[PDB]
Design an enzyme around this catalytic site. Structure first.
Site, mmCIF file in Angstrom:
data_model
loop_
_atom_site.group_PDB
_atom_site.id
_atom_site.type_symbol
_atom_site.label_atom_id
_atom_site.label_comp_id
_atom_site.label_asym_id
_atom_site.label_seq_id
_atom_site.Cartn_x
_atom_site.Cartn_y
_atom_site.Cartn_z
ATOM 1 N N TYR A 41 -12.844 0.914 14.113
ATOM 2 C CA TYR A 41 -11.531 0.864 13.494
ATOM 3 C C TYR A 41 -10.753 2.214 13.754
ATOM 4 O O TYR A 41 -11.205 3.177 13.314
ATOM 5 C CB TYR A 41 -11.692 0.868 11.861
ATOM 6 C CG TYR A 41 -10.327 0.376 11.341
ATOM 7 C CD1 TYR A 41 -9.166 1.128 11.291
ATOM 8 C CD2 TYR A 41 -10.368 -0.999 10.736
ATOM 9 C CE1 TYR A 41 -8.084 0.775 10.662
ATOM 10 C CE2 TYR A 41 -8.968 -1.581 10.042
ATOM 11 C CZ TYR A 41 -7.965 -0.581 10.233
ATOM 12 O OH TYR A 41 -6.761 -0.956 9.488
ATOM 13 N N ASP B 291 -5.062 1.741 -0.206
ATOM 14 C CA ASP B 291 -3.860 0.672 0.064
ATOM 15 C C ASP B 291 -2.813 0.881 -0.400
ATOM 16 O O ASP B 291 -2.509 1.362 -1.667
ATOM 17 C CB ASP B 291 -4.333 -0.839 -0.114
ATOM 18 C CG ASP B 291 -5.614 -1.491 0.291
ATOM 19 O OD1 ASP B 291 -5.444 -1.769 1.595
ATOM 20 O OD2 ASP B 291 -6.784 -1.344 0.016
ATOM 21 N N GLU C 299 -10.327 -10.028 8.519
ATOM 22 C CA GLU C 299 -10.637 -8.640 7.722
ATOM 23 C C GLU C 299 -10.137 -9.394 6.350
ATOM 24 O O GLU C 299 -9.206 -9.753 6.266
ATOM 25 C CB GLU C 299 -9.678 -7.787 8.026
ATOM 26 C CG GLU C 299 -10.442 -6.512 7.770
ATOM 27 C CD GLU C 299 -11.758 -6.308 8.108
ATOM 28 O OE1 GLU C 299 -12.043 -6.574 9.490
ATOM 29 O OE2 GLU C 299 -12.619 -5.658 7.575
HETATM 30 O O1 LIG Z 1 -1.351 -3.809 8.408
HETATM 31 P P1 LIG Z 1 -1.526 -2.659 7.357
HETATM 32 O O2 LIG Z 1 -0.890 -1.316 7.298
HETATM 33 O O3 LIG Z 1 -1.470 -3.135 5.900
HETATM 34 O O4 LIG Z 1 -3.264 -2.584 7.505
HETATM 35 C C1 LIG Z 1 -4.196 -3.356 7.113
HETATM 36 C C2 LIG Z 1 -4.906 -3.182 6.200
HETATM 37 N N1 LIG Z 1 -6.091 -3.791 6.026
HETATM 38 S S1 LIG Z 1 -7.769 -3.388 6.581
HETATM 39 O O5 LIG Z 1 -8.765 -4.115 6.573
HETATM 40 O O6 LIG Z 1 -7.239 -3.158 8.237
HETATM 41 C C3 LIG Z 1 -8.244 -1.822 6.103
HETATM 42 C C4 LIG Z 1 -9.366 -0.996 6.432
HETATM 43 C C5 LIG Z 1 -9.747 0.352 6.160
HETATM 44 C C6 LIG Z 1 -8.986 0.995 5.087
HETATM 45 O O7 LIG Z 1 -9.285 2.307 4.616
HETATM 46 C C7 LIG Z 1 -9.501 3.349 5.389
HETATM 47 F F1 LIG Z 1 -8.978 3.551 6.409
HETATM 48 F F2 LIG Z 1 -9.663 4.408 4.591
HETATM 49 F F3 LIG Z 1 -11.174 3.343 5.649
HETATM 50 C C8 LIG Z 1 -7.521 0.319 4.519
HETATM 51 C C9 LIG Z 1 -7.102 -0.812 5.234
#
Ligand SMILES: O=P(O)(O)OCCNS(=O)(=O)c1ccc(OC(F)(F)F)cc1
Ligand SMILES: O=P(O)(O)OCCNS(=O)(=O)c1ccc(OC(F)(F)F)cc1
Ligand SMILES: *Cc1c(COP(=O)(O)O)cnc(C)c1O
Ligand SMILES: *Cc1c(COP(=O)(O)O)cnc(C)c1O
Ligand code: NA
Ligand code: NA
Lengths: 258, 394, 394, 258
Positions: free
Chosen positions: A175, A60, A49
């Site tokens: 997801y 984020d 990812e």
């Molecule tokens: O381990 P963490 O808590 O840092 O999570 C990983 C983050 N990377 S990710 O690509 O999964 C990811 C994927 C979708 C996101 O936004 C949404 F949910 F609003 F759509 C935010 C992060």
């Protein structure tokens, strides 16, 4: 899409879950980022990812926020990210590659043009963080036209209507958010509606969490901040950074095996 | 789906993470219910009248128009409690929050004006207010920061990104995306994801409604044009709303031109920006060729919003409203002129609107025209800024 | 002789050099004529309504009185153009000046508030305004000085004497005693030689008149008491006037107690000063045992007038009105309380009035009482003062 | 009063006008002020006009304003002024002495008590600068009860009514203002109404002005700022100060003689 299908089919035959790490492209630098990614893969990452540095990642947490900051400090641009993606695909032909994007970077030079570029470099899926299912039409359509899997987020409070939409519109993987906020039952319903295999994300930072996800019925787990934290903690030690990343990823992947 | 159209033509929408959609849907439903609730309207009207001081005056400025055929009126939002039009909608949003059973308020602010408005409304209505502000603005707006704390609001500096408004806008969302159950996000302008553009317009439309009744009483006819500055678009749409169906009434929005459009240092995304998707909406914005969001520059911090409300972009597209820009120097000149000729110190934000009206008058002094400028706020807060400039110039 | 009684009991009079008597007689005659002139009243009402923003709101403060039997309303003069009640009478005096055929205005100011009010009224009505201010106040009130100049007024520092208000009051007279033919002296409070105490009361009485109509509409009865701070006495007499004949309505004036009456550092001449003859009138004042005029101290510069209006000294003598004092700390506490509980930042001057109302409520929480506090002005100007204190105290 | 009557009678027999200088008591100091006053008298002063330091002399220009400032800097008080007055009278028994006062200093410890004190030390007249005829009743009555002449000011714009009042209420001399403002026909009317002899004041700073005043029918002229200016100009030279004062006064007095 195809790469995800093959991956999940192969993992299922081995009765194991997938471990998908997240990192920001170009963090802390182009060269070091490429090495980080090769390390993650050699360590056991089943898929990737990858985030494209954006000026305002409102989805984020601090960790990822600084990842984009470091990337920008390195002069990393979307164009350079696509060059990195092309190379990553040239080195690893089967690993699924998913991008974590923000709407403006996709819409900027045309939504269709963006997905066409993704297909050209070998990207498999795109998750646009600030595009809810309600506004997803043009994005998912462009994705499908270029054989790109549009990734949808299934919140922990998602209702039947949302579950059905995510199941019919999504591809590659679903997801599954473990909680609300930002980075730092449902599973049974998704399978009932033939949704793409679910990958649990957000808050995944320990091997036991990966095992729990798989045990709960999920096809795997995604971990970002835990990975990014290792990067910002070893900025002064590039060699030590890779060593620690290899150790963390190998531990997380081991937890997904049967 | 939604109860109301989230779009104004191609502009608008609800571009937020999936997790925030329930919060937006809940808000839209509560707003729709409130609008049909006589009890809600009565409470809102009570606060506006007896607490905020509505209706505000419509002042005829005979001195500044001497020697011309222009008749100019100023809608006095500078006389509203708080010194700016922002107070109108924060009171309405605070009531919506209570209607939904929430006791906490989340707000973002750059110049600090919206932060102060949110704090006063929250103190009055017994809500716990927490405000996000860019660190660059915190140290640059010490006075407003102290006002917020004096009213019991918690101020939280934001060092992420450029540490400005846009950066505060993101941090506020991140917080709400995990507490919308007991907290309401009090957005500060007629922008952002639906239903905010609509709610803010409706909670600011009394500006235009009062103006219409007042101008009809005083002149027996509608204005040839109503003029308002545009930072995010709330005071402008508040003035415009009730006149949209009055085809003979021109609607003129004024964006900040900063040092000049050609210098690239300005805050006029509607006419000189590029459509993008950010802050939960599709609208014109200040952005790099790559799609990275930029900041808007203006001598007036209040017009620093890097984008613009979607309804304005729509009104522009169909030709119902016209948008122009006014530079730092033109706004400064207007500021000085109103002070000396009418004894009113206008906010530098509002001075952009006045400046354009002065241009309309001066360029064609023999043109018979009845103009109304929305004096969105008072300028006591801009005294030092104007002073330092006049000084640095000798 | 004169048309109206220059005295309120033993207080008042016209103690000015013989050369200035014609100016006072002319002014009294013009005032009397203006009061019976429907055209003058219409013009004054027009300015008050469409320029100043009258009528001002009467706000019910339910939060601050929770748990008690006190119902408190605040007359919102803080919402008046300029941010303080001073605007009412300067507009009236500016009109009187024009009625007498004068095109120049002379004014004195300490904290600078009256200077700003005189400047705005003069700019609006096309009068040449010149303002005298003590050098000590000039360097201590840079913001107000810039506001005055922005509005085209000429500011002249006074270094004579203690270089404060009283010193500016003398310099203004000296000027007028040689130019009253084309210039009008716009006195800033309900004091000085007749007819000023009377004129200022009459040009401020709309405060009390509006309050009466508003309280009758909202409560169906008159207040048990109206409370106002007393520096010179204008906002207080403006609130009191229309209630004088309503024997059941208590009239409470609040003088500044500074660091405490016993410390000698205060501004409460009415109850702790000694009757003398200065500034053209016989009234209680701050003076040495020898008869030298002293200065009044208060955390609030606006309550620095070393004396008090003669009508207040008279109302006190006959027992129609009661006067009390509030210390710096009590005023500061009231200031903080209104900010956090009602979302209104009051002027430190007005905070003295509020403080006494809070004492009336807190000392006897089960006493049923309907009180009105005249919120003479807004406190945005006092932010730094309050801040530095809270800081210097940790 | 008596001293003024005798003076004007004696001056009339010599066909000359009176020259009356003004100075602030205690300026620049008690001792130096006493010397200044003795010099003025030895130089030709026919009468004296003496001010008691007041915190707010709103009828005086800059020159006199600073005179009071210097006096206060010396700690001069009303009580000390009366001690000086007693001594001045003990040294000069016939010269008329008039005080220039401000209302509060007279009203302070009782109006009657003030005039009683004036009579006790030998003062002949009192002019209260901020008390117009309209408010003069208690002051003129107390003055007369203690054989003190109440001095009234006749402005250049005075009407018939005012002239009649000043003529009937005044004693000693009528103060004829040469102009409006502060320190720095009518004559015929005053005589017609048997007003006290007129002394022109304000702006008198040259010998020709004294001659003009007398030629116009006035009984004399008063000069203050011109005198006080000599004091503040020679503060560093007490001896030179007296020398210059003697020269100015002798020149001004000479101009009043026939
Ligand atoms: O381990 P963490 O808590 O840092 O999570 C990983 C983050 N990377 S990710 O690509 O999964 C990811 C994927 C979708 C996101 O936004 C949404 F949910 F609003 F759509 C935010 C992060
Ligand atoms: O020479 P100048 O111009 O300084 O005049 C001398 C001043 N000393 S004085 O006692 O005559 C004098 C007398 C009365 C005054 O005030 C009043 F007119 F209002 F009543 C002021 C000064
Ligand atoms: C905040 C502000 C503005 C800018 O915001 P809009 O939402 O564009 O109205 C304009 N004028 C004043 C006085 C303001 O406080
Ligand atoms: C000037 C001022 C006062 C004091 O003057 P008064 O004549 O006693 O009213 C009180 N409150 C405010 C806000 C002022 O500006
Ligand atoms: Na904008
Ligand atoms: Na006072």
């Amino acid at each position: 899409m195809e790469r995800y299908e093959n991956l999940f089919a192969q993992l299922n035959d081995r009765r194991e879950g997938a471990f998908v790490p997240f990192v920001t492209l170009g963090d802390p630098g182009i060269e070091q980022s490429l090495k980080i990614i090769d390390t993650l893969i050699d360590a056991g990452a089943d898929a990737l990812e990858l985030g494209v540095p954006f000026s305002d990642p409102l989805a984020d947490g601090p960790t990822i926020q600084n990842a984009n900051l470091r990337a920008f400090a390195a002069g990393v641009t979307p164009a350079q990210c696509f060059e990195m993606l092309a190379l990553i695909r040239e080195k690893h032909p089967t690993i699924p590659i998913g991008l974590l994007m923000y709407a403006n970077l996709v819409f900027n030079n045309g939504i269709d043009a963006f997905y066409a570029r993704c297909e050209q470099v070998g990207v498999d899926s795109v998750l646009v963080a600030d595009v809810p299912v309600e506004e997803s039409a043009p994005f998912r359509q462009a994705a499908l036209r270029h054989n790109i899997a549009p990734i949808f987020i299934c919140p922990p409070n998602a209702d039947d209507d949302l579950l059905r939409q995510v199941a019919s519109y999504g591809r590659g993987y679903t997801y599954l958010l473990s909680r609300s906020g930002v980075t730092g039952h449902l599973i049974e319903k998704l399978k009932e509606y033939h949704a793409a295999p679910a990958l649990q994300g957000f808050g995944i930072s320990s091997p036991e969490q990966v095992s729990a996800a798989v045990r709960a019925g999920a096809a795997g787990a995604i971990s970002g901040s835990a990975i990014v934290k290792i990067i910002e903690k070893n900025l002064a030690s590039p060699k030590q950074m890779l060593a620690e990343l290899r150790s963390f990823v190998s531990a997380m992947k081991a937890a997904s095996r049967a | 789906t939604t109860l109301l159209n989230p779009y104004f033509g191609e502009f608008g929408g609800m571009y937020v993470p999936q997790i925030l959609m329930p919060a937006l849907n809940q808000l839209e439903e509560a707003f729709v219910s409130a609008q049909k609730d006589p009890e809600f309207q009565a409470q809102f009207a009570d606060l506006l009248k007896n607490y905020a001081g509505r209706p505000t005056a419509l002042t005829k400025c005979q001195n500044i128009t001497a020697g011309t055929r222009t008749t100019l009126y100023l809608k006095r939002e500078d006389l509203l409690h708080g010194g700016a039009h922002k107070t109108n909608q924060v009171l309405g949003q605070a009531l919506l929050a209570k209607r939904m059973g929430k006791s906490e308020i989340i707000a973002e602010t750059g110049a600090g004006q919206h932060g102060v408005a949110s704090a006063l409304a929250s103190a009055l209505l017994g809500l716990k207010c927490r405000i996000y502000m860019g660190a660059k603005d915190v140290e640059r707006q010490s006075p407003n920061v102290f006002r917020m704390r004096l009213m019991g609001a918690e101020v939280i500096p934001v060092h992420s990104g450029s540490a400005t408004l846009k950066d505060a806008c993101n941090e506020a969302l991140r917080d709400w995306s995990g507490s919308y159950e007991t907290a309401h996000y009090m957005l500060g302008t007629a922008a952002g994801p639906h239903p905010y553009p609509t709610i803010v317009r409706e909670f600011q439309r009394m500006i235009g409604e009062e103006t219409k009744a007042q101008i009809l009483d005083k002149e027996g006819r509608l204005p040839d044009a109503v003029i308002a500055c545009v930072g995010g678009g709330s005071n402008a749409i508040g003035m415009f709303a009730d006149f949209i169906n009055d085809t003979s009434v021109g609607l003129i929005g004024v964006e900040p031109g900063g040092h000049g459009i050609e210098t690239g240092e300005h805050g006029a995304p509607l006419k000189h920006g590029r459509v993008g998707i950010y802050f939960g909406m599709k609208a014109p914005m200040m952005q790099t060729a790559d799609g990275q969001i930029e900041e808007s520059y203006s001598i007036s911090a209040g017009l620093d919003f890097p984008s613009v409300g979607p309804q304005h972009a729509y009104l522009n597209s169909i030709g119902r409203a016209d948008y122009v820009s006014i530079t730092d120097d033109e706004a400064l000149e207007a500021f000085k002129t109103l002070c000396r000729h009418e004894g009113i110190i206008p906010a530098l934000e509002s001075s952009h609107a006045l400046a354009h009206a002065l241009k309309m008058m001066r360029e064609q002094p023999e043109k018979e025209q009845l103009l109304v400028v929305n004096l969105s706020g008072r300028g006591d807060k801009d005294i030092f800024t104007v002073h330092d400039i006049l000084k640095a110039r000798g």
